[PDB]
Amino acid sequence: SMQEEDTFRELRIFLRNVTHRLAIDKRFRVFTKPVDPDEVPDYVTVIKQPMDLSSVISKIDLHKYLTVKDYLRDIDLICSNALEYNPDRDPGDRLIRHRACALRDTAYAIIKEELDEDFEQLCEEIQESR
Ligand SMILES: Cc1nnc2c(NC3CCN(CC(C)(C)F)CC3)cc(C(=O)N3[C@@H]4c5ccccc5C[C@H]3C(=O)N[C@@H]4C(C)C)nn12
C-alpha cells in the first residue's frame, strides 16, 4: 500500500542520515569506499562479501533494506570483514579492527537512541507479510 511505501521511504531517509553521520567521522574514512584490490592486494580473495558505507548508500537507494535489522546486517559485515582480514597483533591491523568495532558500536548506539521500536516493528511486519 501507499502507507507502507511511506513507511519504507521514512526508513530510507533515516538510514541515509545515520550512514552520512558515520561517513563524515574521520575515524571511519577507510570504510567510506570499497577496498581497492591494487592498494590492498590480498583482500578480494579472502573477503567474499565486501561491504562499505558507499555500497550501503547504494543499497538504501535501490530499496534493498526494508528493516533496520537488514541495514545492521551490512554494518556488522563491514566490522566482521575488518576483523577477518586484519587478525594480527601488528598496530596497523589493531587500528583497523578498533575503527571497525567503533563504526559498528556507533551505528548501534545511534539506532538505540533515535529509532522508535514500533517503527522498526511496523517495518518487520510489512516485510514478513510480503
Ligand atoms: C576496510 C579495510 N579493511 N582492512 C583494511 C586495511 N588493512 C591494512 C592492510 C595493510 N596493513 C599493514 C600492516 C599493519 C600489516 F603493516 C594494515 C591494515 C587497510 C585499509 C585502507 O587503509 N584503505 C585506504 C582507504 C582510504 C579511503 C577509503 C577506503 C580505503 C580502503 C583501503 C584501501 O583500499 N585503500 C586506502 C589505502 C590507504 C590503502 N582499509 N581496510
Curated annotation (Swiss-Prot):
Please state where this protein is localized: Nucleus
Q: Which organism is it from?
A: Homo sapiens
Which gene specifies this protein's sequence? ATAD2
Q: In which tissues is it expressed?
A: Highly expressed in estrogen receptor positive breast tumors and in osteosarcoma tumors.
State what induces this protein.
Up-regulated in breast, uterus, colon, ovary, and stomach tumors. Induced in breast cancer cells overexpressing NCOA3 or treated with estrogen. Down-regulated in 5-fluorouracil-resistant derivatives of the colon cancer cell line HCT 116.
Protein task: May be a transcriptional coactivator of the nuclear receptor ESR1 required to induce the expression of a subset of estradiol target genes, such as CCND1, MYC and E2F1. May play a role in the recruitment or occupancy of CREBBP at some ESR1 target gene promoters. May be required for histone hyperacetylation. Involved in the estrogen-induced cell proliferation and cell cycle progression of breast cancer cells.
Q: What is this protein called?
A: ATPase family AAA domain-containing protein 2
Q: Which domain of life is it from?
A: Eukaryota
Similarity section: Belongs to the AAA ATPase family.
Positions of the Bromo domain: 3-114
Q: How does this polypeptide assemble, per the annotation? A: Interacts with ESR1 and NCOA3 and these interactions are enhanced by estradiol. Interacts with acetylated lysine residues on histone H1.4, H2A, H2B and H3 (in vitro).
Top-level taxonomy:
Eukaryota, Metazoa, Chordata, Craniata, Vertebrata
Coiled-coil spans in chain: 108-130
